[PDB]
Amino acid sequence: EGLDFPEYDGVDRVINVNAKNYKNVFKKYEVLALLYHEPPEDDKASQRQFEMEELILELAAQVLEDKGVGFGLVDSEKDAAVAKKLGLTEVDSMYVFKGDEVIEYDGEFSADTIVEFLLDVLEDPVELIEGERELQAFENIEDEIKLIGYFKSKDSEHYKAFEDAAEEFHPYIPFFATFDSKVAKKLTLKLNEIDFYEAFMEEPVTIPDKPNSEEEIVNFVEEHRRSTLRKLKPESMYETWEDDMDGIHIVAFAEEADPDGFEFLETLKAVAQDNTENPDLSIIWIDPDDFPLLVPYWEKTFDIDLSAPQIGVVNVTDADSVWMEMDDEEDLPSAEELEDWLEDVLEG
Numbered sequence: 001e002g003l004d005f006p007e008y009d010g011v012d013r014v015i016n017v018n019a020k021n022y023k024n025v026f027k028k029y030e031v032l033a034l035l036y037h038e039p040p041e042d043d044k045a046s047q048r049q050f051e052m053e054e055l056i057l058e059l060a061a062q063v064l065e066d067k068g069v070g071f072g073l074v075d076s077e078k079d080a081a082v083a084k085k086l087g088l089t090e091v092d093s094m095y096v097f098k099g100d101e102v103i104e105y106d107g108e109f110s111a112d113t114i115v116e117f118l119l120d121v122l123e124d125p126v127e128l129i130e131g132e133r134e135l136q137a138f139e140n141i142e143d144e145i146k147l148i149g150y151f152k153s154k155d156s157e158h159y160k161a162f163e164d165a166a167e168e169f170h171p172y173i174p175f176f177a178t179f180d181s182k183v184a185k186k187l188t189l190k191l192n193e194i195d196f197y198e199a200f201m202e203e204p205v206t207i208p209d210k211p212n213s214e215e216e217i218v219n220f221v222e223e224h225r226r227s228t229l230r231k232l233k234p235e236s237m238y239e240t241w242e243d244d245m246d247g248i249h250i251v252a253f254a255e256e257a258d259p260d261g262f263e264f265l266e267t268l269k270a271v272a273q274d275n276t277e278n279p280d281l282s283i284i285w286i287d288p289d290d291f292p293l294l295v296p297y298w299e300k301t302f303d304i305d306l307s308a309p310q311i312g313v314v315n316v317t318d319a320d321s322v323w324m325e326m327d328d329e330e331d332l333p334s335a336e337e338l339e340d341w342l343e344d345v346l347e348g
């Protein structure tokens with residue numbers, strides 16, 4: 001008899017966090033994920049929706065039990081006093097507490113993404129570059145903002161300020177550091193210098209006025225928080241989509257694992273690089289392979305075939321959209337053709 005794969009065991013591990021136990025709960029767990037939620041309305045549908053959300057947390061709780069991650073619920077009415085003491089303000093959101101750090105979760109509510117997120121939370125906020133493999137891994141990061149600094153040692157005042165700033169964006173924005181002058185020469189970094197890499201960009205921008213305090217780094221990252229080309233990721237999809245440019249998003253569908261999707265993606269990078277100075281411009285790359293449960297909805301709402309690359313303009317108010325025509329029997333449009341089509345659409 002072969003041993004079974006792991007399965008959900010039906011044992012309840014999600015804690016009802018209330019005024020009587022919330023102090024004891026925070027002492028038991030190093031990392032604690034709390035769902036701050038309104039009580040479900042009396043209709044059956046609202047109870048089923050909450051029933052689903054709680055079981056998703058139960059699954060994540062079973063997977064992360066051995067690593068010491070706790071899961072809890074905070075009722076916005078029954079536990080209003082707990083919400084005030086913990087700083088839980090945005091209802092129906094999940095808050096992650098890692099010691100004396102509070103991390104808000106801005107992603108899809110599924111066991112997959114929540115578990116991957118919390119595993120990232122558990123890691124140290126700064127990743128150290130020592131060997132060639134670590135340096136090569138840093139250079140190959142392109143689908144997200146990244147920062148790298150060169151400091152004298154882990155005990156440098158300027159590294160500790162860099163580490164304090166990394167905790168503010170943990171674990172969404174990767175922070176990298178080196179204390180090796182050879183690695184710093186390969187990255188063209190002076191001592192206490194921090195290079196900021198916009199997503200999908202080759203040239204970094206140096207944070208000015210080095211050495212940088214924690215506040216200088218935090219102010220710089222927030223000011224450059226929106227890259228010209230951004231990828232929609234499950235762990236941060238709601239944050240990205242709410243940062244629209246005056247009510248619209250330019251949306252591009254491209255399956256990276258597909259040869260046409262890959263070619264179209266390389267064109268999108270060229271478009272973004274050629275317009276990287278434009279502050280208002282926001283292009284969102286969606287890989288439909290990352291969101292299989294939304295593909296039927298997207299194909300119906302936008303009247304497009306996601307088996308092929310697509311690009312359009314979406315109105316965030318009503319989901320009204322317009323999508324560029326592309327005939328697959330010929331070459332995909334060049335960056336010049338894409339820029340031309342976007343100009344005419346946006347001119348209206």
Ligand SMILES: [Ca+2]
Binds near residue numbers: 016017073074075079
């Ligand atoms: Ca509770």
Ligand SMILES: [Ca+2]
Binds near residue numbers: 187188189
């Ligand atoms: Ca440099």
Ligand SMILES: [Ca+2]
Binds near residue numbers: 209210211212
């Ligand atoms: Ca400074």
Ligand SMILES: [Ca+2]
Binds near residue numbers: 198227228276277
């Ligand atoms: Ca840019």
